[PDB]
Amino acid sequence: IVEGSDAEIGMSPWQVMLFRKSPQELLCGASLISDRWVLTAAHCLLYPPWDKNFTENDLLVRIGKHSRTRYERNIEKISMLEKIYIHPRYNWRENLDRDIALMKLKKPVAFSDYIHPVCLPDRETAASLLQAGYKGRVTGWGNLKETGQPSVLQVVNLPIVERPVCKDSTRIRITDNMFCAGYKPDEGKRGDACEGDSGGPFVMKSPFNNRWYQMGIVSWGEGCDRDGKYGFYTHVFRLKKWIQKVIDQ
């Protein structure tokens, strides 16, 4: 996260860290949507251009974390993956269209003050909150700058941007399964997700029922926190049908 701030304790209890077993390292961010399901970006698990193609056994998910590198004894919980599910129409060849994936845990994780699931939006929630100007929150343990690593989870609030503006900021083809967020140059304020933040959640707190909803997933960007550029996120609601089908199994 570039130009963000240290998260408060228990501020993002659904935050999940995808951890690589062998070379123990940070693989991506993710989110907890139930005691047995974790949501993340498809490119965190599958991305042929970089020869990335993880299997259930290549990684672990660490839930309830704050510190990036420390093993948080008595607080974080480490889970193994039973199965990975990548959206069948995930477009890694061109623009990361439908950049979403699900991971089923071998055993349900126990909720606590630091481990709690985030809500997934319904049609009305999406319709009412996904508006240009409305701010969401992005969290992650990724790079603090484009070109280092944070000590603890970082957080930044960013406004959703009008589709025309998102489109005119890049050469990449944008789809309805994406939305972009970030401040414009004339708005002064800054902030963006960066390398390592992939798969993390873009959340919004409903002013109607005061619950947190995950509206997006950190998907892609060109550089980090560059003027005239924006971060792009997977449109969670647009792909909820797939999510429900997988969970319903």
């Binding site: 701030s5 228990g10 501020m11 630091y114 699931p117 701010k135 609030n157 707190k205 619950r211």
Partner: peptide, 27 residues
């Protein structure tokens, strides 16, 4: 269920330092 309600915040009626910024943007 109780999704989206944080044990250390919503559940205790405590607000985090920047959530108000989000609310204020929902004009």
């Amino acid at each position: 269920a109780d999704c989206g309600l944080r044990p250390l915040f919503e559940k205790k009626s405590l607000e985090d330092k920047t959530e108000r910024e989000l609310l204020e943007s929902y004009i």
